[PDB]
Design a protein around this nucleic acid. Sequence first.
DNA 1: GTAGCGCGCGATGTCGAGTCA
DNA 2: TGACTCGACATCGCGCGCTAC
Lengths: 57, 477
Amino acid sequence: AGLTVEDLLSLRQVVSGNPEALAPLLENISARYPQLREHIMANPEVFVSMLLEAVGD
Amino acid sequence: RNCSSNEERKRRKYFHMLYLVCLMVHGFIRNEWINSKRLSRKLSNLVPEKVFELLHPQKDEELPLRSTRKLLDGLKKCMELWQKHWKITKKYDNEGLYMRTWKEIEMSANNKRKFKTLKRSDFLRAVSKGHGDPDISVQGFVAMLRACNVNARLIMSCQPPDFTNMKIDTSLNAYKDMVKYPIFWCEVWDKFSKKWITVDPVNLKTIEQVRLHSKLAPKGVACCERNMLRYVIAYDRKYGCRDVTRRYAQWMNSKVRKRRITKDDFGEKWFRKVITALHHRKRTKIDDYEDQYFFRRDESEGIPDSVQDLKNHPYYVLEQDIKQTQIVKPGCKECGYLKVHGKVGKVLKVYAKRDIADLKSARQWYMNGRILKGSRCKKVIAERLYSFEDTELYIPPLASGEITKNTFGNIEVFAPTMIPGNCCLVENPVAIKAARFLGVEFAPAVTSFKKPVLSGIVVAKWLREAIETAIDGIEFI
DNA sequence: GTAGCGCGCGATGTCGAGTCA
DNA sequence: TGACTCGACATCGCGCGCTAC
């Protein structure tokens, strides 16, 4: 249940400042991470927190 | 016909959840950026002493109302001066954050193009210059109120794609029609009347103290194509996140619940996981005052005005939609009538769902882990059925570890209750192989029908660990 | 508020797929 | 393997929401 850090960063960045452009990125990443789907159903709060602390800063 | 596969159905539900989570997180982060201390300090100097004092009125003991009024005048003066600060109001490119069609999505996926990244700096710069679309504008407005130390939420109506839209075409009949109601707006807390004031300084330029009806909730078939009110999320100064839809939904339990993921139980539990994920503070007394408003709102909605809205309603059902296997609980009766629009004089009996009992036969109850005692059947269909209060848990009999089982040497386990107290259930295709190889004293578990199903074993708990080891070593048998 | 008026909106039915027992 | 479900699209008559007083 996991993802690189280059995708988690770009995704935080779209989600934060350009969410109009979400659609193709999510298509891509969902096509590159099948398991993400069932993850999101079971444990959304983890994926959330991952998107919140790309601020190890 | 125009209908898609159950697979596409399931994808639409998932992608809806995904897109929603992203939207709501964006709300979370943008609300962070709103709190920026460097920006706040610059925006504060926009607000004269007179208005500032109006925004923080003195407690008036004899008539709290007059304090509320001063705040309203303050809020109105702020809206006005914000109109003046915001010099450049852009148009949303394309559709902004309004709801999009499955076709539109699929096609945006396809075409990748080039997208100018934004980030946090560029946002700040925009708000200070006064350049942006209405979303930026309102968001800035909330920043300003916050720099004046008012309790000012950011409200976001999240518009994910509709997971209740089953059609394979998905095509609509206008820009003016999309922008009629806002995606973003503001609430402000009245300590005197203990209520949240709704404020939309950019689109409707009004201030309302919503009681039962709100100007902000979109109306008319054309306008709702791109704005379908489902999730109204409130973010506060201290990084709260609260679902405030009930303020803004006239029919929450009827109309709106059919269009939210929360209509089944899996949906609700998932949604609550995300809100809690986004709610980074602890409960205050204001939270309680709000919950009280929502409760009263939730109990004043009542029966809807149409048959379609009484399908699968959380609280209510027409007498005609009561299932063959349901009855009216003794000494209850109709709770209301529904005049049926467009049939003269035709009236229907509405029952409350709490006055309806679900009945099951003896086997069906056993299959929920319940047995019956000397009761009476409530209805026959030809097999006698019984109410839930006619019934009782089944406690199956509990040294060496032989379990008394059904005639076939298995155990019927349709519920955790049905494992004896001193035993454990171990589910695994070869668990019987394991148990047979190391002997012991187990018992096959029948958990469901295909027509039985032995999905695993019931063994005394002391012996569980052994099987787990043998199973782990099954290749060595 | 009222009459004159066109049609939008909700009730009813069927059609196909799917779900529970 | 059968009752019961869910959403689209058709059909259809009401009276709803316009002006224009």
